[PDB]
Design a binder for this molecule. Structure first.
Ligand SMILES: Nc1ncnc2c1nc(Br)n2[C@@H]1O[C@H](CO)[C@@H](O)[C@H]1O
Ligand SMILES: [Mg+2]
Length: 390
């Protein structure tokens, strides 16, 4: 009579990493890609023979900086003249050009110079997330919910839908990232009465705090605040400067001018930073870092915490601003939700818990997966077509 319907997917289309989930058998499955990764880099690389997307693009970035595109989310739905765009362009190794006051990324691809709109680059990331899901389900996927930041305007939301349509996806709905994190915890299923929820989102390059009110499953964004110049990469930079100084003291050599050595040091620092979230110390072991000298050293969690102390404390300023804007007091917040990999940092959690006078933090859903989790829960709700009984 009626054939079984394919599952719909929830996609967190992130600035630096994207994540895909599916709700089946009363539970969400976050889908790992073919390299076993639960999150996929939002990177697209171009060569004379191939277009690479995800881990394959990010793993060759060092020798192909001009033709590897990342951060398209910072350009999506914006004008080329926008002050945000002009500032970001100074930090990017790829070319950004002006086509009718609309930014386009220009690269060498398959023997030609090619320019792409930000929605086209995002459609390539969405095609990879769709293929990750189809490899797990074993059938073609059509329907998806895609998330965006709460501060995205109409043009930014329409360009995200356009990216979905180019990728061959039927976009069920564009939902806000903090709303998706709240849905992941079922904070919209607690019944009658108003609930105030704070979402604390610390990413690779930006920090966002959102205050939502939930009443009978209805969401209202009460306040947004953040820091565009605060994220995981700033903590990596602090360890980089620390170890460059350490090499100078120990071997009387300045390494800061060999890009390969700085890159090898930064890659090692980012992994040591992750180890320090679960261990009280971490080792750093690089062979022939500079002038055939092996760099074998360590860093305690106490020293790393000291190195990033001002940065961690500065996350509380947008929290206080969001609470003033929402016209609420900290005691009036019912639930605290953590979003982003950088929230695993024990000191970040301690500062926030202390700010909210010992309150529990919702961190049981991996913070780098919570947004995709909630988008998957929403996607399964949106495709239901139940007919009422007599
Ligand atoms: N366990 C973790 N402890 C500390 N940091 C982490 C962890 N896992 C992830 Br993921 N990160 C950082 O999150 C950011 C996501 O873009 C990157 O800067 C990652 O380094
Ligand atoms: Mg995010």
């Amino acid at each position: 009579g009626s054939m079984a319907k394919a599952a719909a997917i929830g996609i967190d289309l992130g600035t630096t990493y994207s994540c895909v989930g599916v709700f089946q058998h009363g539970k969400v499955e976050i889908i790992a890609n073919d390299q076993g990764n639960r999150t996929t880099p939002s990177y697209v690389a171009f060569t004379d023979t191939e277009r690479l997307i995800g881990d394959a693009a990010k793993n060759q970035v060092a020798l192909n900086p001009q033709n590897t595109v990342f951060d398209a989310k910072r350009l999506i739905g914006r004008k080329f003249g926008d002050p945000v765009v002009q500032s970001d362009m100074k930090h990017w190794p790829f070319q950004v050009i002006n086509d009718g006051d609309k930014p386009k990324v220009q690269v060498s691809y398959k023997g030609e110079t090619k320019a792409f709109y930000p929605e086209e680059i995002s459609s390539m990331v969405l095609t990879k997330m769709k293929e990750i899901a189809e490899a797990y389900l074993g059938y073609p996927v059509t329907n998806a919910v895609i998330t965006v930041p709460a501060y995205f305007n109409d043009s930014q939301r329409q360009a995200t839908k356009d990216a979905g349509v180019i990728a061959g996806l039927n976009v069920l709905r564009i939902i806000n990232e903090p709303t998706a994190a709240a849905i992941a915890y079922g904070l919209d299923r607690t019944g009658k009465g108003e609930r105030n929820v704070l979402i604390f989102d610390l990413g690779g390059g930006t920090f966002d705090v959102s205050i939502l009110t939930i009443d009978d499953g209805i969401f209202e964004v009460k306040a947004t605040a953040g820091d565009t110049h605060l994220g995981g990469e700033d903590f990596d930079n602090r360890l980089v400067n620390h170890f460059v100084e350490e090499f100078k003291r120990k071997h009387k050599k300045d390494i800061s001018q060999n890009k390969r050595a700085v890159r090898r040091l930064r890659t090692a620092c980012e992994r040591a930073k992750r180890t320090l979230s679960s261990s009280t110390q971490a080792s750093l072991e690089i062979d022939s870092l500079f002038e055939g000298i092996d760099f074998y050293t360590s860093i305690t969690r106490a020293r790393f915490e000291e190195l990033c102390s001002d940065l961690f404390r500065s996350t509380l300023e947008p929290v206080e601003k969001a609470l003033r804007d929402a016209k609420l007091d900290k005691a009036q917040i019912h639930d605290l939700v953590l979003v982003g990999g950088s929230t695993r940092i024990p000191k970040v959690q301690k500062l926030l818990q202390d700010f909210f006078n010992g309150r529990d933090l919702n961190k049981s859903i991996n913070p780098d997966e919570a947004v995709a989790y909630g988008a998957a829960v929403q996607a399964a709700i949106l495709i239901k077509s139940t007919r009422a009984a007599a």
